Amino acid sequence: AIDLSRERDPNFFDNPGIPVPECFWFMFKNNVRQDAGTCYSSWKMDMKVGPNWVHIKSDDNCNLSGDFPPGWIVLGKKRPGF
Amino acid sequence: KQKIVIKVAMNCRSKAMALVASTGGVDSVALVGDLRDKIEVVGYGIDPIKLISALRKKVGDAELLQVSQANKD
Amino acid sequence: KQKIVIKVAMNCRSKAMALVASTGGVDSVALVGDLRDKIEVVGYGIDPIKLISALRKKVGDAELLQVSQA
């Protein structure tokens, strides 16, 4: 059921004093979208995914990895023009 | 710079935004998220634990969702 | 969808940021400029006249630098 090509863009705000994050991320529980936001490529972030904090890494093409709790996933995609 | 994302229970939006924005070291605050119920705060020397406690004490329930202590450069 | 940029005289920074952030219609507030002495406010149905008057009355001098569509 998960197809990022059909997912609406997140609500975001790019802080003007730091570089613009290159990725959108999308968080699902049992393939239902829970929320979404932005993050840097080739980087890392700590995010509460359901009950647990997860250290999520991003590669240069916004593919995200991390040890997600059962039923949960976070997926990335390159923003327009990046 | 740090980036902190906090979910707040929802005139709680404006009160939460004002409280966060008044915090020392804040560069920006923005309402984000699919339900517009998260505050994304960018700044320096912000203590997220104290920030969450202040929100809980003065505004309403709040949950820490995301922390980076340093943005990519 | 508005973007309003205000120069504010400057703990006046935190007071100004809090006042602007509390304003109806506001989605985001950000300090901009190398000296962090301008506030960028983005949102919908924000009244810039009332915002400027409130800042002047509660914090200090404030000047409109930009009002536009974002």
Verbal overview:
The complex is a heterotrimer, with one copy of chain A (82 residues) and two copies of chain B. Chain A is mainly beta and 82 residues long. Chain A has one domain (1-82). Chain A is built from no helices and six strands. Chain A has strands at 23-29, 32-39, 43-49, 52-58, 64-65, 72-78. In chain A, the strands form two sheets. Chain A has a three-stranded antiparallel β-sheet with strand order 2-1-6, with no helix packed on it. Chain A has a three-stranded antiparallel β-sheet with strand order 3-4-5, with no helix packed on it. Chain B has a four-stranded antiparallel β-sheet, covered by helices on one side. With 73 residues, chain B is of the alpha+beta class. Chain B starts with a strand and ends in a 5-residue tail after the last strand. Chain B has one domain (1-73): Alpha-Beta Plaits, CATH 3.30.70. Chain B is 29% helix and 37% strand. Chain B has helices at residues 12-21, 48-58; strands spanning 2-8, 26-32, 38-43, 62-68. Chains in contact: A-B, A-C, B-C. The A-B interface holds A 10-13, 15-19, 21, 33-37, 40, 42-43, 45-48 and B 1, 3, 5, 27-28, 30-36, 38, 40, 42, 63-68, 71-73. Strand 3 (43-49) of chain A pairs antiparallel with strand 4 (62-68) of chain B, so a sheet runs across the interface.
User: What is the SS-derived class of chain A?
Assistant: mainly beta
Helix content of chain B: 25-40%
Number of helices of chain B: 2
Largest sheet of chain A: 3 strands, antiparallel
CATH topology of chain B: Alpha-Beta Plaits
Q: Which sequence of SSEs, written as H and E, runs from N to C of chain B?
A: EHEEHE
- Count of structural domains of chain A: 1
What is the gyration radius of chain A calculated from CA atoms? 12 Å
Terminal Cα span of chain B: 10 Å
CATH architecture of chain B: 2-Layer Sandwich
